[PDB]
């Protein structure tokens, strides 16, 4: 009679239904809440506008695509319940919104790439509103690229007779020769180019961040900040970010050595920082002019690279080059045995806390020592940038693969097994595609929050 039925069990449909609903509460709440939370306030503004556009897109995917497809595409497969305009309209909207979320994710990866990798070059100067026009153009491209779906999709009577009312389905009506063209184009524009961009860009971000020395945010913990002259651990005269000056007693030459203006014992914030910049600069410069400390510095990464600078900052190139064998092991990646060496009477266990903190950094190559404060900014930057690529590709890859085989697996391996597998596959793929628009609110608040670097 109408043997175009699909035999996917009630239990898998309940499962998928559940999942879709969870995805729905999460996606809708997150997108809505973000777009109305950033309906209130450069250059992070630009990334805010990008986020706004993103959340809007995802929200519209959830509102327009989900309910109808949940009914007609996963529960009652035939006939098509919403008429021709229903059919073409649905598919056009689907297409438009997906182009939108893809182009947006890309554009955001591009903007972030610019901000982080070319801060002065790109970010501060070139990047500025109106990038509203960019988002506008994105939406326009979404619409125009979705235009084909209005001609390709349609209503067709596929019942055995081709006359019975219960066989009226929504399906590509044009010649199958063109269907391939259309969906291949869609595959490239909505997945391939974007996914390549996301991939390489975010990878470059991640590597740039992993290679950046968190040295400053590290010292601000250990060394603190006092903009009125004081006494340090061993009772010498210090100001600013632990900048020792005129260590000789007493309070007078200390105040004289306050250069550069008559400090009168007190300094301003921007002065304590500019002082701190010079100190950190003279440390690295001390590292790179010293024959014992340079090649060790060179071989290290970025964390244990900061760890050294800390020590050089605290004790000068002269003292740190006095740790001969520890250096020999650090250069040899003996993190284990070199940590034990430093922990020995190193005499620099006159301040054990600061020493313990530096050795468990050297040892682990991670920031576990420095509390849960945003010295973890870089690492989180990395992880978030990985999350982006993983999330996008995982969520959208199988979706596009399923669409390709609709028109390519075509002829003639279309068995019962394949016809079935196709629809279970469909469940899966739309589940992931809808997982995109619910994972990316929560994820992208984390990258929005992750701009303490700039």
């Amino acid at each position: 009679n109408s043997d175009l039925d699909v035999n996917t069990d009630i239990y898998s449909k309940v499962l998928v239904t559940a999942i879709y609903l969870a995805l729905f509460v999460v996606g809708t709440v997150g997108n809505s809440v973000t777009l109305f939370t950033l309906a209130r306030k450069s250059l992070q503004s630009t990334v805010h506008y990008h986020l706004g556009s993103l959340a809007l897109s995802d929200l519209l995917i959830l509102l327009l695509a989900m309910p109808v497809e949940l009914y007609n595409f996963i529960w009652v497969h035939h006939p098509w319940a919403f008429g021709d305009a229903g059919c073409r309209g649905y598919y056009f909207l689907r297409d438009a919104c997906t182009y939108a979320t893809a182009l947006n994710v890309a554009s955001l990866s591009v903007a972030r790439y610019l901000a982080i990798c070319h801060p002065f070059k790109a970010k501060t100067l070139m990047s500025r509103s109106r990038t509203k026009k960019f988002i506008s153009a994105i939406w326009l491209a979404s619409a125009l690229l979705a235009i084909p779906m209005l001609f390709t999709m349609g209503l067709q009577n596929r019942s055995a007779d081709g006359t019975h009312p219960g066989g009226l389905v929504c399906t590509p009506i044009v010649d199958t020769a063109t269907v391939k063209v259309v969906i291949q184009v869609n595959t490239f524009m909505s997945f391939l180019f974007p996914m390549l961009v996301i991939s390489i860009l975010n990878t470059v971000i991640a590597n740039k961040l992993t290679v950046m020395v968190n040295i400053f945010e590290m010292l601000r913990i250990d060394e603190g900040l006092r903009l009125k002259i004081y006494k340090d651990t061993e009772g010498y005269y210090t100001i600013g970010i632990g900048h020792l000056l005129t260590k000789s007693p007493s309070l007078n030459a200390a105040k004289s050595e306050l250069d550069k203006r008559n400090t009168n014992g007190v300094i301003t914030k921007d002065e304590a920082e500019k002082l701190f910049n010079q100190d950190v600069d003279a440390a690295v410069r001390g590292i790179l002019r010293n024959a014992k400390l340079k090649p060790v510095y060179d071989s290290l990464d970025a964390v244990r690279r900061a760890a050294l600078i800390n020590m050089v900052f605290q004790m000068g190139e002269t003292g740190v080059a006095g740790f001969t064998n520890s250096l020999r092991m650090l250069n040899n990646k003996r993190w284990d045995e070199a940590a034990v060496n430093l922990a020995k009477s190193r005499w620099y266990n006159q301040t054990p806390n600061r020493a313990k903190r530096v050795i468990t950094t050297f040892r682990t190559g991670t920031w576990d020592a420095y509390g849960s404060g945003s010295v973890q900014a870089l690492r989180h930057g990395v992880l978030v940038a990985r999350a982006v690529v993983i999330a996008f590709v995982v969520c959208w890859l199988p979706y596009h693969v399923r669409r390709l085989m609709f028109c390519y697996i075509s002829d003639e391996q279309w068995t019962t097994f394949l016809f079935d597998f196709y629809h279970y596959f469909y469940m899966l793929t739309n589940a992931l595609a809808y997982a995109s628009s619910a994972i990316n609110p929560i994820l992208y608040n984390l990258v929005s929050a992750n701009f303490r670097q700039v």
Binding site: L4, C170, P172, F406
Partner: peptide, 6 residues
């Protein structure tokens, strides 16, 4: 005989 749903 193939799927009708894209």
């Amino acid at each position: 005989r193939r799927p009708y749903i894209l």
